[PDB]
Paper text:
Intracellular ADPR targets and activates the nonselective, calcium-permeable TRPM2 channel in the presence of Ca2+. Belonging to the transient receptor potential melastatin family (TRPM), TRPM2 shares a characteristic MHR1-4 domain, a transmembrane domain (TMD), and a coiled-coil domain with the other family members. It is unique due to owning a characteristic C-terminal NUDT9-H domain, which has been considered a classic binding site for ADPR and its derivatives, but the presence of the ADPR binding site has not been directly observed. In summary, our human TRPM2 structures defined two distinctive ADPR binding sites, one in the MHR1/2 domain and one in the NUDT9-H domain.
In the EDTA-hsTRPM2 structure, the NUDT9-H domain is clamped between cognate and adjacent MHR1/2 domains, forming both intra- and intersubunit interfaces, while only the intrasubunit interface exists in the EDTA-drTRPM2 structure. As a consequence, the NUDT9-H domain forms a compact structure interacting with the adjacent MHR1/2 domain in hsTRPM2, whereas it hangs freely in the drTRPM2 on the bottom of the protein. In the absence of ADPR, their interface is made of extensive interactions between the core region of NUDT9-H and MHR1. Accordingly, we call the interface between MHR1/2 and NUDT9-H a resting interface in the apo state and an activation interface in the ADPR-bound state. The EDTA-hsTRPM2 and the 8-Br-cADPR/Ca2+-hsTRPM2 structures were nearly identical, and they clearly represented an apo-resting state and an antagonist-bound inhibited closed state, respectively. By comparing the distances between the Cα of adjacent pore-restricting residues—N1049 and Q1053—with those in drTRPM2, all four showed an occluded pore, including the ADPR/Ca2+-hsTRPM2 structure. Lastly, the hsTRPM2 has a well-defined NUDT9-H domain that has two major interfaces with the rest of protein, one with the cognate MHR1/2 and the other with the adjacent MHR1/2 domain.
Numbering used by the authors:
A (entry chain D): 902 to 980, 1020 to 1052
B (entry chain A): 524 to 581, 614 to 976
C (entry chain A): 1053 to 1098, 1105 to 1165
D (entry chain D): 1128 to 1165
E (entry chain C): 977 to 980, 1020 to 1052
Write the structure that this text describes.
């Protein structure tokens, strides 16, 4: 409830001369922000369960291995093993660090 | 018999006339122009799905609707001012304009002469504009009556509808008219009214008897007012929005169950859930196989397969099928369990990439998918140059600040971790 | 900025086959679909009127006459609007003064 | 002030070039008829 | 955070932060700075 009352303070800048139109613009942009968030979420959970599946055996740990993989996937979202690790890391650097940001550049520049 | 001998159509007519067997069967010195020769060469240009316009035979006489025959004769010689006069007195003008656009757009591709090719292409675009201009005038007066023009079967043009001609001729401006989009949306919602929204459809998908309440739309109010709930349920489940949503929910449950089996239930002896996902994927490929053998028009089976295999998502689907049938026979050999596990993991990634196909049906999201499908091409070539730059500075950093050391995975992987950081 | 202007036309063109496939598809989810499959196989053992249908001739004649009338009205509007272009007005004005030139020079 | 506005609007609508061409085209027809009739 | 059964609760807090912070205000800056540029 405190968070919901503190979101009320954004109503101030509508009375400003040059700030109101920005509020209208972000009220427009929310609609496809949400639908982009859905696809990034399903992509990230896909690569997370792939990473947990390949590099570990079948283990029934409830909050050990699942929360460890969740922390690894959250750390990845915040950003002879040489060939395999280089392949996984270059796949992540290919997909995550480029394409969806280009989609956001395109979509946000479009709706702006 | 008196076409000008410089046009392409005259050369094609000469070729099909000399290639006929029955005229040198009669007399090789006497080739005789018959009307079914013209019908045979028109069937090639206009598309295989139509019928022959002039039938093979086995005072005066008219054919049915002579003005289309005069129009076809005036078009293929590229006579603009004659065709502009003749089309003004035609009978069913919209199908005529679309067929003329299709013929000229087909003829302009194989002429090998530049100025006449540009003249033909401009004329085809002009006739597409004529068709749009008549249809919007028809659409302004009545809504529901003018939809019937898009779907009737005209016997004058080889028993095809007016929509297939626009779809085959790539007439992009006609299909995006807006009345056509309203018609496609009306087909998409099916039986019920188009304005109830998506979330209401999800809730009545969730709840069976909520459809029997007064929270849903209908049109053709004899079904809305008089409530026969078995018929109302059949009409609700017949609409393709509902079938699309049930299919995507079944696909989502399939993906979640496959992830659960791949996580913990992987086992060399066959579990029952492996048989469940096996028959699920068998059902999916059975429906995909059924979609290829449908063709009601007697078209090319190789042409149908070439159309299917040229598709992007169909190629991704058959790639996932190939990876699944590889991983299954890798799993059944008990000495190759871990390769089967990693191959099925990559197969899971390939099946989960299939879920991006959803947003094409969205109104404002499809163009974004087209844009990223364009952007991939230079994303890849930029990735090459960044990779060679980074490995260059990495081997430079390892070379300057260390002596010559032959460590296999100590110093090389340490420098690899430093370069990745 | 190269392709963002007109790709919506390509999407509107690409909408149709996605509509038509699900219109033609049997109404069962992929687990429970197979019985419908074998039901269709019974039709294999022994189109639709929504995208393609043959009308009745007494109704089709009325429809075609209505289309004829609207074509006529469209041609009237197009010819009248092509008369009012300013370039055509200047051309008509230039053609009209030559008759006055010849009439003044001949007498 | 309404009267003054209407005067200004009518005078500015007279000075469009399309209207000037239309008036020029209408004026030459009287000369055509006068030259053809006599 | 400005420099950038607990599973459900931690995932909810982290996805709320990843929703709000990493997206929207940067879009507002894209809009406003592109506008005044």
């Amino acid at each position: 409830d405190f968070i919901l009352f503190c979101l009320r303070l954004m109503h101030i800048f509508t009375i400003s001369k040059t700030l109101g139109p920005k509020i209208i613009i972000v009220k427009r942009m929310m609609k496809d922000v949400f639908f982009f968030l859905f696809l990034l979420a399903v992509w990230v959970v896909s690569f997370g369960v792939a990473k947990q599946a390949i590099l570990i055996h079948n283990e029934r740990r409830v909050d050990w291995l699942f929360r460890g993989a969740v922390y690894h996937s959250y750390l990845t979202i915040f950003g002879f093993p040489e060939w395999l690790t280089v392949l996984l890391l270059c796949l992540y650097l290919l997909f995550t660090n480029i394409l969806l940001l280009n989609l956001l550049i395109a979509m946000f520049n479009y709706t702006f | 018999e008196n076409l000008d001998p410089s046009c392409l159509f005259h050369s094609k007519l000469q070729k099909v006339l000399v290639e006929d067997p029955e005229r040198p069967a009669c007399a090789p010195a006497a080739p005789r122009l018959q009307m079914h020769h013209v019908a045979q060469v028109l069937r090639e240009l206009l598309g295989d799905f139509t019928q022959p316009l002039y039938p093979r035979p086995r005072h005066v006489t008219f054919t049915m609707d002579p003005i289309r025959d005069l129009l076809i004769w005036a078009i293929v010689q590229n006579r603009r001012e004659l065709a502009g006069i003749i089309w003004a007195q035609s009978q069913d003008c919209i199908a005529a304009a679309l067929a003329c656009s299709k013929i000229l757009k087909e003829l302009s591709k194989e002429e090998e002469d530049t100025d006449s090719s540009e003249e033909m292409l401009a004329l085809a675009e002009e006739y597409e504009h004529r068709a749009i201009g008549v249809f919007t005038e028809c659409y302004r007066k009545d809504e529901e009556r003018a939809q019937k023009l898009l779907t009737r079967v005209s016997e004058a043009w080889g028993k095809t509808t007016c929509l297939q001609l626009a779809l085959e001729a790539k007439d992009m401006k006609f299909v995006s008219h807006g009345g056509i989009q309203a018609f496609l949306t009306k087909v998409w919602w099916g039986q019920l009214s188009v304005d109830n929204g998506l979330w209401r459809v999800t809730l009545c998908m969730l709840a069976f008897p909520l459809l029997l309440t007064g929270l849903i739309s209908f049109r053709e109010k004899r079904l809305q007012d008089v409530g026969t709930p078995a018929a109302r349920a059949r009409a609700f489940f017949t609409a393709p929005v509902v079938v699309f949503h049930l299919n995507i929910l079944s696909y989502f449950a399939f993906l979640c169950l496959f992830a659960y089996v791949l996580m913990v239930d992987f086992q060399p002896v066959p579990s029952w859930c492996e048989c469940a996902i096996y028959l699920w994927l068998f059902s999916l490929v059975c429906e995909e196989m059924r979609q290829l053998f449908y063709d009601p028009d007697e078209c090319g089976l190789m042409k149908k397969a070439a159309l299917y295999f040229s598709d992007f998502w169909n190629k991704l689907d058959v790639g996932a099928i190939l990876l699944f049938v590889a991983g299954l026979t890798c799993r059944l050999i008990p000495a190759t369990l871990y390769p089967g596990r990693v191959i099925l993991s990559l197969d899971f990634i390939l099946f989960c990439l299939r879920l991006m196909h959803i947003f094409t049906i969205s109104k404002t999201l499809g163009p974004k998918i087209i844009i990223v499908k364009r952007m991939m091409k230079d994303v890849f070539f930029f990735l090459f140059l960044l990779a060679v730059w980074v490995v260059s500075f990495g081997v430079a950093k390892q070379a300057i600040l260390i002596h010559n050391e032959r460590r296999v995975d100590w110093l090389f992987r340490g420098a690899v971790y430093h370069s990745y950081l | 900025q190269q392709v963002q202007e007109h790709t919506d036309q390509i999407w509107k063109f690409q909408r149709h086959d996605l509509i038509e496939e699900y219109h033609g598809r049997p109404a069962a989810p992929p687990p429970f679909i197979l019985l419908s499959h074998l039901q269709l196989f019974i039709k294999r053992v022994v189109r639709h009127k929504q995208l393609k249908n043959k009308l009745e001739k007494n109704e089709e004649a009325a429809l075609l006459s209505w289309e004829i009338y609207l074509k006529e009205n469209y041609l009237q509007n197009r010819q009248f609007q092509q008369k009012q272009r300013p370039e055509q007005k200047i051309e008509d004005i230039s053609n009209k003064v030559d008759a006055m030139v010849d009439l003044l020079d001949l007498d």
